[PDB]
Amino acid sequence: GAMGESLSIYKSGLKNDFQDWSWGEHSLTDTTNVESGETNSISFTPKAYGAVFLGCFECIDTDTYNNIEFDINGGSSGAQLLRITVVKNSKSVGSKLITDLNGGTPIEANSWTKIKASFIDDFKVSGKVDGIWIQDIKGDTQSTVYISNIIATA
Secondary structure, X not given: OOOOOXXXXXXXXXXXXXXXXXXXXXXXXXXXXXXXXXXXXXXXXXXXXXXXXXXXXXXXXXXXXXXXXXXXXXXXXXXXXEEEEEEEOOEEEEEEEHHHHOOOOOOOOOOEEEEEEEHHHHOOOOOXXXXXXXXXXXOOXXXXXXXXXXXXXX
16 A cells, blocks of 8 residues: 555575676575575675666656665675666666675675665665666675565655
């Protein structure tokens, strides 16, 4: 009813027709660091500017969902340097630093952090969005991160 809409993208596996277009090293079925109540996470070892990229052509209309959200675990080290990018019209149209999205704090090691980004507020993007990616920006290898509960929200 009046409860705002949500669209799951990954909840212990891909949902709602989203597609794995990732080019970095990752697994969609990591079972070593899972949130309570889930069975799998995406594991991602950020390196060589790889990224986890979840795609669904024009599936997210900002007239229905204001934000993109995910839970991230910083693994052994935390504090990974990552860029979160939104894709519209088959091109990247906006990016944000994960530390920025986390209020200026580097993501904590060994524990799960909610990451919220607003399409208009954070990416200055509106209309139909084709996907989101989480990209390594260090090149040099970073400790493995875990991603869970990817969801589009009003």
